[PDB]
Amino acid sequence: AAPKNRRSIEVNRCRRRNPQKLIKVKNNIDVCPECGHLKQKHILCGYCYEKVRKETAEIRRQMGKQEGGPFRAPTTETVVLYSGETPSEQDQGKRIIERERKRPSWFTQN
Amino acid sequence: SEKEFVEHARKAGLVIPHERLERPIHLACTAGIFDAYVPPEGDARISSLSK
Amino acid sequence: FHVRVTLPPRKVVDRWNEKRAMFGVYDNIGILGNFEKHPKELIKGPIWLRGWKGNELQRCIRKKRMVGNRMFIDDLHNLNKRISYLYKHFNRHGKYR
Amino acid sequence: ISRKWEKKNKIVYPPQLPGEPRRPAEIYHCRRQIKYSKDKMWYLAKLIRGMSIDQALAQLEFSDKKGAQIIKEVLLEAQDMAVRDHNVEFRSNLYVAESTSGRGQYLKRIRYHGRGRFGIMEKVFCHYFVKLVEGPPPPREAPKTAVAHAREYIQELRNRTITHAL
Amino acid sequence: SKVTLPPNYRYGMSRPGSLSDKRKNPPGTRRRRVPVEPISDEDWHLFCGDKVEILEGKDAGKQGKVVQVIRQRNWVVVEGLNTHYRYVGKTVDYRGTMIPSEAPLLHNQVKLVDPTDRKPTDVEWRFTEAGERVRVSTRSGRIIPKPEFPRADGIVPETWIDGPKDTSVEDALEKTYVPRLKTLEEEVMEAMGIQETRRHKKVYWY
RNA sequence: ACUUCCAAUCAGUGAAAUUAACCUUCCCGUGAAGAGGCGGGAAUAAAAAAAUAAGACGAGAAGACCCUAUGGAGCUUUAAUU
RNA sequence: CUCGCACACGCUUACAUCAGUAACUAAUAAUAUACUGAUAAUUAACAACCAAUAAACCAAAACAACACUAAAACGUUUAUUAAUUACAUUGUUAACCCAACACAGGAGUGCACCAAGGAAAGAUUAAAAGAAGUAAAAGGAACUCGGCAAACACAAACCCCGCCU
RNA sequence: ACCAAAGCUAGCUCAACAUACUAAACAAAUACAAAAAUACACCAAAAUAAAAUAAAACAUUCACCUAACAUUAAAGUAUAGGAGAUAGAAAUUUUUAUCCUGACGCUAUAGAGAUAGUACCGUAAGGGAAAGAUGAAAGAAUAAAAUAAAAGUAAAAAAAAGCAAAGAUUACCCCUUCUACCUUUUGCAUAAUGGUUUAACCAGAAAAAAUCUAACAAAGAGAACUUUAGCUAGAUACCCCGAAACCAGACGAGCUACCCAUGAGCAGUUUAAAAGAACCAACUCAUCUAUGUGGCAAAAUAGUGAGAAGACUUGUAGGUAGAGGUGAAAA
Ligand SMILES: [K+]
Ligand SMILES: [K+]
Ligand SMILES: [K+]
Ligand SMILES: [K+]
Ligand SMILES: [K+]
Ligand SMILES: [K+]
Ligand SMILES: [K+]
Ligand SMILES: [K+]
Ligand SMILES: [K+]
Ligand SMILES: [Mg+2]
Ligand SMILES: [Mg+2]
Ligand SMILES: [Mg+2]
Ligand SMILES: [Mg+2]
Ligand SMILES: [Mg+2]
Ligand SMILES: [Mg+2]
Ligand SMILES: [Mg+2]
Ligand SMILES: [Mg+2]
Ligand SMILES: [Mg+2]
Ligand SMILES: [Mg+2]
Ligand SMILES: [Mg+2]
Ligand SMILES: [Mg+2]
Ligand SMILES: [Mg+2]
Ligand SMILES: [Mg+2]
Ligand SMILES: [Mg+2]
Ligand SMILES: [Mg+2]
Ligand SMILES: [Mg+2]
Ligand SMILES: [Mg+2]
Ligand SMILES: [Mg+2]
Ligand SMILES: [Mg+2]
Ligand SMILES: [Mg+2]
Ligand SMILES: [Mg+2]
Ligand SMILES: [Mg+2]
Ligand SMILES: [Mg+2]
Ligand SMILES: [Mg+2]
Ligand SMILES: [Mg+2]
Ligand SMILES: [Mg+2]
Ligand SMILES: [Mg+2]
Ligand SMILES: [Mg+2]
Ligand SMILES: [Mg+2]
Ligand SMILES: [Mg+2]
Ligand SMILES: [Mg+2]
Ligand SMILES: [Mg+2]
Ligand SMILES: [Mg+2]
Ligand SMILES: [Mg+2]
Ligand SMILES: [Mg+2]
Ligand SMILES: [Mg+2]
Ligand SMILES: [Mg+2]
Ligand SMILES: [Mg+2]
Ligand SMILES: [Mg+2]
Ligand SMILES: [Mg+2]
Ligand SMILES: [Mg+2]
Ligand SMILES: [Mg+2]
Ligand SMILES: [Mg+2]
Ligand SMILES: [Mg+2]
Ligand SMILES: [Mg+2]
Ligand SMILES: [Mg+2]
Ligand SMILES: [Mg+2]
Ligand SMILES: [Mg+2]
Ligand SMILES: [Mg+2]
Ligand SMILES: [Mg+2]
Ligand SMILES: [Mg+2]
Ligand SMILES: [Mg+2]
Ligand SMILES: [Mg+2]
Ligand SMILES: [Mg+2]
Ligand SMILES: [Mg+2]
Ligand SMILES: [Mg+2]
Ligand SMILES: [Mg+2]
Ligand SMILES: [Mg+2]
Ligand SMILES: [Mg+2]
Ligand SMILES: [Mg+2]
Ligand SMILES: [Mg+2]
Ligand SMILES: [Mg+2]
Ligand SMILES: [Mg+2]
Ligand SMILES: [Mg+2]
Ligand SMILES: [Mg+2]
Ligand SMILES: [Mg+2]
Ligand SMILES: [Zn+2]
């Protein structure tokens, strides 16, 4: 079908500015206690997660160099140790990942 | 249909154009100060004395 | 319909130059000259229009008669088409007839 | 083309006599030739009218529109101008007084359909204009109450005069 | 190397093959033609290096030295008299080296200055009995010598040192030509002892 | 009944036929003889999204049918001229 | 999930290295075989170019032994001449060509069907209508112009018009 | 407030004068498939122009329409014409040289098509564009000045009811009164035609007889003619867009119809068979239905089908050209 007449701008403005078609505001925005940036209540902080993801990639990159083959996987548990630390008695019998940087604050040793 | 945009402004400098100036730039005054005078630290108190 | 927004430089025309002061001086050469030169022997312009007047058809015909052999190929063709169209329009068209 | 929004920041007002009310700051900023469309950019501009700059950035932080990032950059760089180029302290004391979207220069292309037909394609470009004014945001107007409607109606019935009287 | 220019062109104190000129005038543009009064090469009495006096502008009555002449638009550029100020060093976080720049002047605003009285005087070319074209003043009636100016190369022939690939003046002016009626082909062949016996056959030209 | 491509919501790019102005209802009557607009009455806060195609004599092609034009052309011959 | 390598014909640097993409090109983004700037490249053995006259000679290709009817591309030797003298010239890239498009179309030969080449879904919800596919109670053409379409069927016979390919 | 607006040059037109008329560039290569130094040749040619149109049809005829050596008159006269349309001379007459040339011609939708026969669309003949704006200096781009005035949007979505307006009113509506505009018709709000809106551009033209004004008047006119108040001069006049067609000369058989050269394909299976036999692929046609209908596609995709050792498919290259070619006739 084809339109019969040109829509006037008075009609178009009513349709294009109806409250349904407008952008709704968000009232669930909060400041992250740790870093002070912005995040939603039900969503993890973007800055804090990006902080973790960068560190996780570095740890995984070190693991790749410790298993050259593409089908080599450990048969035991894994523990990550940073500079200035030594494996504990309970941590023995597990593969050791060494990182040169100082242990990050958020990461907690057990 | 084959119409595009023009007028993107950028400032590029090379040694060659600067060395090819037919008339060298004339400077009315020098750039820096030849020697900086070093006043004695007591001028804040000597200024209160006339002679 | 946008008009210019700046006043143009006014044309300072001098009414007393050589052309305007001496305009139409020898128009009465025949009257006051023992009738030796008709005033039509002062007209400057086309060869076929010195001292002659006519409508569009008689002008194109006259041009072809005098300077027809001196015209260019393309100009000679365009003149022929103009003569034919005017001949057909003036005689075979119109209101009063 | 026309560029008058940029030149509004060069207006210098005469010095104020002592005792006069403090003049709130006014910062005019804009961005030209944004790839985003004119109509789509308008909804984002309508969103942040009348809100303070800090909550205006918060709303545009999580918006999924491609223009949300573009507007947030404009507000951030306009805030830096306000606190440095102008003597506006308290960089959190600004509110978006006016925001709107204009149309730029379009590029025309050919869009093919089939059967040897074609349609002219318009590459869309839009501008964004924002004005920041120092001070707390103005309070939004509440709907007229029951007493307000009654007061206007009684006043209307009291303005009546004898039509075609004498 | 010679650079071809469009039939209509605008000159702005920049050489045609410069990046500044290309930035100012892109190859795809053409502007309005300015009115330039025609001066024949025999009527241009203003050269580069002679003192001239500025008549009109912010500075009037001052004298200076001509450094550049634009023959295409009939311009003479004095050395730092009709000056406007611009910036040269520009970057994101720094600006400086404020350098005055001299604006062009037309021929009608510049009159040549006689060496003796140091006043502007009309100049007309005259042909003397010695066969040399020397400019002659109107009021004082004294001739004005040509303004010897250093060339654009910046090399003075008076002070020069011959390099490894430079020919000495003695060898350059040494004459060894013996004008005989043998071509260069014949002379070299007999100089090195190249001997040829057979001759070419008949070849038809058409 | 159940899957995939469509579909509806979100993000990016973004076309076409169409369009006198429209603030674009129902019924009966009238009327260039089938009315959203006239007359007599009824109904009637304003907008958005998704659907079904009765009407806008819907959109598309200056009707192929039919006739007219001292307007054309193809074919055939016992038409006229040759 | 499967049209893959190469030559001929065509196109003409669209190929390669490095850098940039606010915008232009890709019908979007990342990004770069496809847009911009600089630099660089295809090396002949393969292919093109690559003698004349006179004379002898009825006897097919099809594994060709020997035959068929439609009677068949495909040359050697003798004689008379032929500049005789390292290295000549030219084609060597590609994701490509003809269709207004980076189009589900059109495109000859050799060898493989892969050891090679590629990605049907941008993210969700799982309404109607529409397209494509699978399955079904009892009945099995009751549908409809017609058994059109679909099918666990893949058969038998009559007539009309043309003989048949 | 965006989009936009404004400018005056580039050059062009019509003449005049005028040398006397294929410019500029030609180092090398240019009619082998042009721009490729180099081998026994063939080389070349002409036959009245026709028709669209006018006669309201159309057959004899139809100005200019290739080749005139002009102007003032004889004259639109003698003559030639389906004696219709219209065509139309001559005898005999007139004409004093050089300068005085420039513009009551246009100014970027104008003027040449032109910034250019270049991009681009066509195999080819051929068709053929849009596009420029600062200032004395941008070697004054933290750069400057100017209108902020077209449609379209933003600033500022809408509140019963009606050709959107008018009469008004303290008050925007509410009330009352009014069947859009042109064209075409006996008659249109008509559900008859055309237009989304804006800017630019686009369509009445001729002086025989006449009327008005004036000069001079039995005579008028700066020769040639008209004259029983007439003669000379001025002023007052008659459009634009559109067919199917017709004729002449070019360019097209790289798609397709047919043919001449030169090549290349047909595996398996069944039979004494390479038999215009049979089953079934590659390959070639396109039966039926469904999607698609500005689509992937200006004829396709999916399923299903017919031929598949022949009157078969197919590559390269050549031949036949419009009063024709070609055709296992479907005009
Ligand atoms: K007439
Ligand atoms: K309907
Ligand atoms: K190519
Ligand atoms: K039946
Ligand atoms: K109709
Ligand atoms: K009509
Ligand atoms: K009309
Ligand atoms: K051929
Ligand atoms: K297709
Ligand atoms: Mg196509
Ligand atoms: Mg449109
Ligand atoms: Mg559009
Ligand atoms: Mg969307
Ligand atoms: Mg309504
Ligand atoms: Mg009715
Ligand atoms: Mg009523
Ligand atoms: Mg009514
Ligand atoms: Mg929808
Ligand atoms: Mg709907
Ligand atoms: Mg209606
Ligand atoms: Mg209907
Ligand atoms: Mg219709
Ligand atoms: Mg009709
Ligand atoms: Mg019929
Ligand atoms: Mg009749
Ligand atoms: Mg007829
Ligand atoms: Mg006819
Ligand atoms: Mg015919
Ligand atoms: Mg007969
Ligand atoms: Mg191409
Ligand atoms: Mg892509
Ligand atoms: Mg890269
Ligand atoms: Mg590249
Ligand atoms: Mg496409
Ligand atoms: Mg995909
Ligand atoms: Mg999708
Ligand atoms: Mg469904
Ligand atoms: Mg089934
Ligand atoms: Mg069942
Ligand atoms: Mg039945
Ligand atoms: Mg039934
Ligand atoms: Mg049937
Ligand atoms: Mg079936
Ligand atoms: Mg029967
Ligand atoms: Mg048959
Ligand atoms: Mg039979
Ligand atoms: Mg006729
Ligand atoms: Mg007629
Ligand atoms: Mg004729
Ligand atoms: Mg007779
Ligand atoms: Mg033009
Ligand atoms: Mg104009
Ligand atoms: Mg406007
Ligand atoms: Mg009303
Ligand atoms: Mg009526
Ligand atoms: Mg009627
Ligand atoms: Mg009438
Ligand atoms: Mg109508
Ligand atoms: Mg009609
Ligand atoms: Mg219409
Ligand atoms: Mg008369
Ligand atoms: Mg005829
Ligand atoms: Mg013909
Ligand atoms: Mg062929
Ligand atoms: Mg076989
Ligand atoms: Mg068979
Ligand atoms: Mg198929
Ligand atoms: Mg199918
Ligand atoms: Mg099926
Ligand atoms: Mg079969
Ligand atoms: Mg069979
Ligand atoms: Mg031919
Ligand atoms: Mg024929
Ligand atoms: Mg056939
Ligand atoms: Mg038949
Ligand atoms: Mg038939
Ligand atoms: Zn955080």
- HEC assignment per residue over chain D: CCCCCHHHHHCCCCCCCCCCCCCCCEEEEEEEEECCCHHHHHHHHHHCCCCEHHHHHHHHHCCCCHHHHHHHHHHHHHHHHHHHCCCCCCCCCEEEEEEEEEECCCEEEEEEEECCEEEEEEECCEEEEEEEEECCCCCCCCCCCHHHHHHHHHHHHHCCCCCCCC
Nearest alpha carbon to residue E84 among E104, E100, E105, E62: E100
Chain D CB within 8 Å of residue B7 CB: no
Nearest alpha carbon to residue D85 among D129, D26, D20: D26
Write the single-letter amino acid at C77.
H
Length of chain C (residues): 97
- The DSSP element (H or E) to which A52 belongs, if any, is helix A46-66
Residue C40 near residue C51 (C-beta atoms within 8 A): yes
Residues 6+ apart with CB under 8 A from D151: none
What is the C-alpha R_g of chain E?
27
Nearest alpha carbon to residue D30 among D51, D5, D49, D53: D5
D109 Cβ within 7 A of any nucleic strand G atom: yes
| Ligand nearest to the Cα of A35, by number | 77
Chain B CB within 8 Å of residue D107 CB: yes
Neighbours of D94 (CB within 10 A): 26
Identify the closest residue of chain B to D122 by CA–CA distance: B1
Length of chain D (residues): 166
Q: Is A48 annotated as a binding residue?
A: yes
Q: How far is D58 from chain A (nearest CA, A)?
A: 7
Write the single-letter amino acid at C83.
I
Distance C86 CA to ligand 61 centre (A): 22
Residues 6+ apart with CB under 8 A from D21: none
Length of chain E (residues): 206
Q: Give CA–CA dist C97/C88, Å, rounded.
A: 14
Q: Give CA–CA dist E122/E66, Å, rounded.
A: 17
Mutation choice for E interface testing from B11, B23, B27 by most E CBs within 10 A: B23
Residue D27 near residue D121 (C-beta atoms within 8 A): no
A54 Cβ within 7 A of any nucleic strand F atom: no
Q: Give CA–CA dist D11/D13, Å, rounded.
A: 6
Chain A residues within an 8 Å CB radius of D43: 21-23
Nearest alpha carbon to residue E51 among E142, E134, E116, E106: E116
How remote is the C-alpha of E94 from its chain's centroid?
A: 37
Residue D136 near residue D95 (C-beta atoms within 8 A): yes
CA angle at A107 for the pair A103 and A110, rounded to the nearest 5°: 95
Tokens of E73: 């638009």
8-state DSSP, C3: P
Q: How far is CA E116 from CA A96, E4, E63, E135, E144, in A?
A: 98, 44, 14, 15, 10
For chains D and B, having 3+ Cβ pairs within 8 Å is answered yes
3-state secondary structure chain B: CCCCCCCCCCCCCCHHHHHCCCCCCCCCCCCCCCCCCCCCCCHHHHCCCCC
Residue A46 near residue A39 (C-beta atoms within 8 A): yes
Write the single-letter amino acid at E85.
Y
Distance in angstroms: CA E202, C1' H73: 77
Q: How far is D92 from chain A (nearest CA, A)?
A: 15
Residues 6+ apart with CB under 8 A from C39: C26, C27, C28, C29, C30
Q: How was this structure determined?
A: cryo-EM
D18 Cβ within 7 A of any nucleic strand G atom: no
Chain B residues within an 8 Å CB radius of D105: 5
Q: Is A14 annotated as a binding residue?
A: no
CATH classification code of D1-166: 3.90.470.10
Residue E98 near residue E43 (C-beta atoms within 8 A): no
Strand F: which of residues 80-119 in chain D lie with Cβ below 7 A? 111, 113, 119
CA angle at D99 for the pair D106 and D124, rounded to the nearest 5°: 15
Q: Are strands E99-102 and E105-106 parallel, antiparallel or unpaired?
A: unpaired
Phi-psi region of C94 (alpha: psi -120 to 50; beta: other; left: phi over 0): left
Nearest alpha carbon to residue D50 among D144, D143, D141: D141
Distance in angstroms: CA A59, C1' F45: 66
Q: Give CA–CA dist C88/D5, Å, rounded.
A: 65
D neighbours by CB contacts (3+ pairs under 8 Å):
A, B
C neighbours by CB contacts (3+ pairs under 8 Å):
none
